[PDB]
Amino acid sequence: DIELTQSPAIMAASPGEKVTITCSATSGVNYMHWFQQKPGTSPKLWIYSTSNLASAVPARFSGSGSGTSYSLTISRMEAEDAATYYCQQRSTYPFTFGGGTKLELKRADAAPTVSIFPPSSEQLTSGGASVVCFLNNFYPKDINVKWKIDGSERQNGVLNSWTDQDSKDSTYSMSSTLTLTKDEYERHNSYTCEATHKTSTSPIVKSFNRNE
Amino acid sequence: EVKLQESGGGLVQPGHSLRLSCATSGFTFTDYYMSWVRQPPGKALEWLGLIRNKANGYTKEYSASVKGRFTISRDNSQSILYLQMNALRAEDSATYYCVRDKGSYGNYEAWFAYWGQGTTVTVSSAKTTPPSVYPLAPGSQTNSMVTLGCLVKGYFPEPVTVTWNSGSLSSGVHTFPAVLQSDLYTLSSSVTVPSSPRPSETVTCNVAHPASSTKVDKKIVPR
Numbered sequence A: 001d002i003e004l005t006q007s008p009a010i011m012a013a014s015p016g017e018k019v020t021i022t023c024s025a026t027s028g029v030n031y032m033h034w035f036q037q038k039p040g041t042s043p044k045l046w047i048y049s050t051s052n053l054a055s056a057v058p059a060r061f062s063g064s065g066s067g068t069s070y071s072l073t074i075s076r077m078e079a080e081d082a083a084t085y086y087c088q089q090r091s092t093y094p095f096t097f098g099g100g101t102k103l104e105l106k107r108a109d110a111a112p113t114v115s116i117f118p119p120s121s122e123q124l125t126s127g128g129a130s131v132v133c134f135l136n137n138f139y140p141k142d143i144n145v146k147w148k149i150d151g152s153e154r155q156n157g158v159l160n161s162w163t164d165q166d167s168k169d170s171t172y173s174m175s176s177t178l179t180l181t182k183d184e185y186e187r188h189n190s191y192t193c194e195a196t197h198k199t200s201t202s203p204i205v206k207s208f209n210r211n212e
Numbered sequence B: 001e002v003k004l005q006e007s008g009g010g011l012v013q014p015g016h017s018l019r020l021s022c023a024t025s026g027f028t029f030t031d032y033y034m035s036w037v038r039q040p041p042g043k044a045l046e047w048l049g050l051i052r053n054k055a056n057g058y059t060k061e062y063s064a065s066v067k068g069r070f071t072i073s074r075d076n077s078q079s080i081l082y083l084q085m086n087a088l089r090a091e092d093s094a095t096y097y098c099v100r101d102k103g104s105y106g107n108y109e110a111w112f113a114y115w116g117q118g119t120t121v122t123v124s125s126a127k128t129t130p131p132s133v134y135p136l137a138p139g140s141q142t143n144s145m146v147t148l149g150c151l152v153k154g155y156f157p158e159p160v161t162v163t164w165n166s167g168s169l170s171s172g173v174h175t176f177p178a179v180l181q182s183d184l185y186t187l188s189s190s191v192t193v194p195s196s197p198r199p200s201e202t203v204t205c206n207v208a209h210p211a212s213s214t215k216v217d218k219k220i221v222p223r
């Protein structure tokens, strides 16, 4: 079991900023190998045989190290380079994979695009009722949501769901869902989705007015 | 085009048996080793083991973590790779990748370069239920970029297919990762098209549940 540690676990760099990473092992290996993983995809070979760049890998990319300590460097950050990187060894069976580093890119802040939608007919006609609310395309990730109904926010039955940095815009989105009984929702009228970001001193919100 | 295709993935009762498949093409199977790797939702990659080539007796290596429980093999008749899974635990729930390992030559520039898309495996007795799909329609047309959504609630297990206008709407699509709640998953699908496409061109949200075999299109109604 040559167990491999990569550090750091996470990191957000700015374009042109320097980057070094390590699959660091409990025992000597002959070669360090590295992969890059980008959301929804299978890994791609990145550096092989410790230092030989893989197919379609930029020369700003290099790999190195020795025995128990190996490295992956990004000379100067580039937006395309963002992904999860996994080091490791095929020295001693069993082959083992590094703990990973999740490299995100630093870009221009962007106010999240908040949207709110009332319970459709069908669901409501299905006997249900729940109010969705996307918080599209923002940066950085760190953002808190807080529903509100008739003045009181909403803790219970609130399940949120982020994504990781989009490939096409380098931003983040969140999706809080407020679910409630068909019968319940009719006991309130104004449901408001509240967004907390560094792009806004105030909690940007959205909201509708229940009607029949 | 070197192609690798894993099937077999689905839900599996705990302690039960699951056989993972993986079709191959564009290379000479028997000449190439083939590992097996897996990744659990939101985590790190885990090497499960390979199987050598013809000139190396098709000898199987494994991971101690999975030794005695998993056997790797391959039908050399029609170049496929397998993975036998026994006494499966929730912690084997993941998505499994067949990868072309080293070969009878020196293209080690290759070796571990070609992966498949991976197949997802969910270890649980837990019951299978298709989803209910509903259109997230706004209220009070404004905003040059009007955003509509798809609420995919009440299905099991993962995954589900969601794309817009029979895949025509790839741009500005926002499908979220499911949330597990009460042994149940839910996600949404947001798209930001202009007024020109909608609600004029008509926008559809085609949802699918491979498991419960649930394919449905929600006509995003203007309201």
Ligand SMILES: Cc1ncc(COP(=O)(O)O)c(CN[C@@H](C)C(=O)O)c1O
Binding pocket: A029, A030, A031, A089, A090, A091, B033, B052, B056, B101, B102, B111, B112
């Ligand atoms: C992909 C790969 N396959 C197989 C092996 C070994 O095969 P046998 O046990 O069947 O000979 C290695 C050793 N990797 C060396 C080159 C290293 O990782 O330094 C390897 O990287």
